């Protein structure tokens, strides 16, 4: 239905960016919103039909374009730290009065790109005391020292992505809570029967997709350019 690209974006203060939005339900009405913790959904701009654009509640710093009915891009003129937010596109028929939202775009605007750090990922193997006591085995995955908070953590068992027996923290922790450009930490758990963990043929992987810089970005640091990448840690089953 409603599509949004990119899913995540890190911007440097002053840069321009266009968040793409496209629906295929032949809807006349399209809108953009930003979602912030203390004040929910705030309408930025909206389009009642092809060629018609109108300011919403918070239009300052943004432009919208509506040449065709399918697409409605949101242009950030000159990125500012106050534009760090989650952006949502939404399509409504405008003729059924129901509105459908896009997947969202997590955007972080930083004063400089030297703040962006990819996560370090580690898998912590189940405890023998847990195994004997409960007959279950919990693997823990930790993603640490990442900035911005634009990460997707998945668990993979024997090459297949798994969802059962897993729970990842809904929000990451701040390593330095007093700081604004603090790096983050995220944990996840995957519980399995003791018998499943005890089979050495079973392979467990914790995969963290991080979104950062592009290969085109300039970089002066000795450390590797913190590009968009997957960082993963693994553990094999063990009869012990």
């Amino acid at each position: 239905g409603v599509t949004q690209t990119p899913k995540f974006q890190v911007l440097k203060t002053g840069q321009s960016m266009t968040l793409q939005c496209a629906q295929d339900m032949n809807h006349e009405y399209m809108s953009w919103y930003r979602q912030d913790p203390g004040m929910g959904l705030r309408l930025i701009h909206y389009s009642v039909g092809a060629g018609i654009t109108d300011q919403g509640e918070v239009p300052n710093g943004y432009n919208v374009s509506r040449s065709t009915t399918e697409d409605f891009p949101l242009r950030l003129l000159s990125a500012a730290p106050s534009q760090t937010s989650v952006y949502f596109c939404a399509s409504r028929p405008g003729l059924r009065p129901e509105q459908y939202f896009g997947p969202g775009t997590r955007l972080t605007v930083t004063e400089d790109l030297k703040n962006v750090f990819p996560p370090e990922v580690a898998v912590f193997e189940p405890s023998e005391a847990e195994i004997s006591h409960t007959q279950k085995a919990t693997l823990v995955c930790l993603a640490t020292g990442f900035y911005p908070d634009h990460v997707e953590l998945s668990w993979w068992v024997n090459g297949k992505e798994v969802h059962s027996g897993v729970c990842t923290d809904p929000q990451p922790l701040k390593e330095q809570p007093a700081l604004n450009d603090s790096r983050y930490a995220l944990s996840s758990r995957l519980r399995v029967s003791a018998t499943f963990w005890q089979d050495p043929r079973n392979h467990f992987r914790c995969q963290v997709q991080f979104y950062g810089l592009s290969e085109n970005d300039e970089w002066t640091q000795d450390r590797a350019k913190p590009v968009t990448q997957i960082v993963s840690a693994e553990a094999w089953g063990r009869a012990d």
Binding site: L95, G102, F124, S127
Partner: protein, 196 residues
């Protein structure tokens, strides 16, 4: 304006989550409930247009245009339902949303066996985490008081194949003083917590 019931609601598994919403525009004709998981997008779960109840699975939306009131009840609540619920009101084919209401559905832990286990990194035994697990939903975990100690909130996993649910929190630290026995010292832990 659209106003919703405040703060996070804590609902035990099996019970009814009760969501309220009052709107200012008396000429409003369309009313909606959206569900939003953390880090995900708002998803339309219910629509109501005329006075009365409207049911769909475990959801029951109620409308009373006279008292400018919309409600959503989530029957037989499951930890799956933990999300933010947004109310949206309109007049004709802008949509006005409320701030939302966070709903937390705590699982029914019938057989708790609280314990704090120590898990070592698959690549390095020097590195470890502390896992507080198998406690019932009546125990809350307090955030880290120390700057170099990291504690995550309780999180519910569901081993769907066995119909088994369990709570757990994770703590870790580079401090030479850090031990799993002192890791959750700021929380009100059950007296019978197993410390292997």
């Amino acid at each position: 304006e659209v106003e919703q019931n405040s703060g996070p609601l804590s609902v035990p598994e099996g019970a009814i989550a009760s969501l309220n919403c009052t709107y200012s525009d008396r000429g409003s004709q369309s009313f909606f409930w959206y569900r939003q998981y953390s880090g995900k997008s708002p998803e339309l779960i219910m629509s109501i247009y005329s006075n009365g109840d409207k049911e769909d699975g475990r959801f029951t939306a109620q409308l009373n245009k006279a008292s400018q009131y919309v409600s959503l009840l989530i029957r037989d609540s499951q930890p799956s339902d933990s999300a933010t619920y947004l109310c949206a009101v309109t007049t004709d084919s802008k949509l006005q949303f409320g701030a939302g209401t966070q709903v937390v559905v705590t699982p029914d832990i019938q057989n708790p066996d609280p314990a704090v286990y120590q898990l070592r990194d698959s690549k390095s035994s020097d590195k470890s985490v502390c896992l507080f697990t198998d406690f019932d939903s009546q125990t809350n975990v307090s955030q880290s008081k120390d700057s170099d100690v990291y504690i995550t909130d309780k999180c519910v996993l569901d081993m769907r194949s066995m119909d088994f649910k369990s709570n757990s929190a994770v703590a870790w630290s580079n401090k030479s003083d850090f031990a799993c026995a002192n890791a959750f010292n700021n929380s009100i832990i059950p007296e019978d917590t197993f410390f292997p």
